[PDB]
Write an enzyme that holds these catalytic residues in place. Structure first.
Site, mmCIF file in Angstrom:
data_model
loop_
_atom_site.group_PDB
_atom_site.id
_atom_site.type_symbol
_atom_site.label_atom_id
_atom_site.label_comp_id
_atom_site.label_asym_id
_atom_site.label_seq_id
_atom_site.Cartn_x
_atom_site.Cartn_y
_atom_site.Cartn_z
ATOM 1 C CB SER A 1 -0.878 0.039 1.256
ATOM 2 O OG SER A 1 -1.838 -0.998 1.259
ATOM 3 C CB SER B 1 1.811 -4.918 2.627
ATOM 4 O OG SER B 1 1.257 -4.520 3.859
ATOM 5 C CD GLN B 2 -4.041 -2.992 -1.263
ATOM 6 O OE1 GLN B 2 -5.025 -2.950 -2.010
ATOM 7 N NE2 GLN B 2 -3.562 -1.919 -0.656
ATOM 8 C CG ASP C 1 4.409 -7.768 9.903
ATOM 9 O OD1 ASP C 1 3.413 -7.033 10.054
ATOM 10 O OD2 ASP C 1 4.936 -7.928 8.777
ATOM 11 C CG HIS D 1 4.340 -4.321 7.953
ATOM 12 N ND1 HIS D 1 4.025 -5.538 7.387
ATOM 13 C CD2 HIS D 1 3.852 -3.379 7.108
ATOM 14 C CE1 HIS D 1 3.380 -5.344 6.250
ATOM 15 N NE2 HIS D 1 3.265 -4.042 6.058
HETATM 16 P P1 LIG Z 1 0.520 -3.114 3.624
HETATM 17 O O1 LIG Z 1 -0.103 -2.869 2.204
HETATM 18 C C1 LIG Z 1 -0.664 -3.050 4.742
HETATM 19 C C2 LIG Z 1 -1.137 -1.741 5.356
HETATM 20 C C3 LIG Z 1 -2.254 -1.983 6.350
HETATM 21 C C4 LIG Z 1 -3.137 -0.789 6.369
HETATM 22 O O2 LIG Z 1 1.558 -2.003 4.094
HETATM 23 C C5 LIG Z 1 2.828 -1.730 3.516
HETATM 24 C C6 LIG Z 1 3.383 -0.540 4.294
HETATM 25 C C7 LIG Z 1 4.641 -0.008 3.614
HETATM 26 O O3 LIG Z 1 5.226 0.784 4.647
HETATM 27 C C8 LIG Z 1 6.097 1.831 4.103
HETATM 28 O O4 LIG Z 1 6.505 1.811 2.932
HETATM 29 N N1 LIG Z 1 6.406 2.791 4.975
HETATM 30 C C9 LIG Z 1 7.261 3.941 4.680
HETATM 31 C C10 LIG Z 1 7.622 4.723 5.942
HETATM 32 C C11 LIG Z 1 6.964 6.102 5.962
HETATM 33 C C12 LIG Z 1 7.520 6.925 7.111
HETATM 34 O O5 LIG Z 1 2.360 0.452 4.180
HETATM 35 C C13 LIG Z 1 2.159 1.549 5.136
HETATM 36 O O6 LIG Z 1 2.396 1.500 6.344
HETATM 37 N N2 LIG Z 1 1.688 2.639 4.529
HETATM 38 C C14 LIG Z 1 1.408 3.907 5.198
HETATM 39 C C15 LIG Z 1 1.863 5.105 4.369
HETATM 40 C C16 LIG Z 1 2.979 5.860 5.062
HETATM 41 C C17 LIG Z 1 2.550 6.308 6.451
#
Ligand SMILES: *[P@@](=O)(CCCC)OC[C@@H](COC(=O)NCCCC)OC(=O)NCCCC
Length: 196
Positions: A26, A104-105, A159, A172
């Protein structure tokens, strides 16, 4: 880089032996995100720039945060998109071996797409890797209708998405090492096994 469309751009007359289709998490950028580029690099070292086509899931797959709450963990339009990519690979390059993955997604999308895939084409997918599999608990760590020996799930202790929740905690975001070593190794091993 974060965007690869080797299959859509590729020539039917000069097909690669292996075709890797990957779905990002996501919010991630391009069509490969943070983990796809690392796996691709490794795949290219094993098969060569001409032996493998790297293809990310773009198009209708927006990788929206809200779609995680949908029944299958992603949207129908996203699923049709990845289904189309598998079918396009089958048509354009009938002798090529397929491998897939998701984070993830994208792990939920890869699972749903592989499940709906026509078995004749699904038989062609030598291995699939999933990181932070959001449907790990619910699906008991499997991809429906797909062999366990062709599936590899990477789920870190702590996670929460692997344990049935949709809360992002530090573990995660620690899949980098896996995407650079063990995941591509698994994929490479599966392809070499099927081709023989
Ligand atoms: P999955 O698709 C599941 C999400 C459940 C709602 O998530 C993947 C993570 C990828 O995380 C990142 O790439 N994070 C970057 C760090 C930013 C500081 O998705 C997220 O956590 N997405 C949120 C968007 C940034 C806050």
């Amino acid at each position: 880089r974060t965007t690869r469309d080797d299959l859509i751009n590729g020539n039917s007359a000069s097909c690669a032996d292996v075709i890797f289709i990957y779905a990002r998490g996501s919010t991630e950028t391009g069509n490969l995100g943070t983990l796809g580029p690392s796996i691709a690099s490794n795949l290219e070292s094993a098969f060569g720039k001409d032996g493998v086509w790297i293809q990310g899931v773009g198009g209708a797959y927006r990788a929206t945060l809200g779609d995680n709450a949908l029944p299958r963990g992603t949207s129908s339009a996203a699923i049709r998109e990845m289904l189309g990519l598998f079918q396009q690979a089958n048509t354009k390059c009938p002798d090529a071996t397929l491998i897939a993955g998701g984070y993830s997604q994208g792990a939920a999308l890869a699972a749903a797409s592989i499940e709906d895939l026509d078995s004749a084409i699904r038989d062609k997918i030598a291995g699939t890797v999933l990181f932070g599999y959001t449907k790990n608990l619910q699906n008991r760590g499997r991809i429906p209708n797909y062999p366990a020996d062709r599936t590899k799930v990477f789920c870190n202790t702590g996670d929460l998405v692997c344990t049935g929740s949709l809360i992002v905690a530090a573990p995660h975001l620690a899949y980098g090492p896996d995407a650079r070593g063990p995941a591509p190794e698994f994929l490479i091993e599966k392809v070499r096994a099927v081709r023989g």
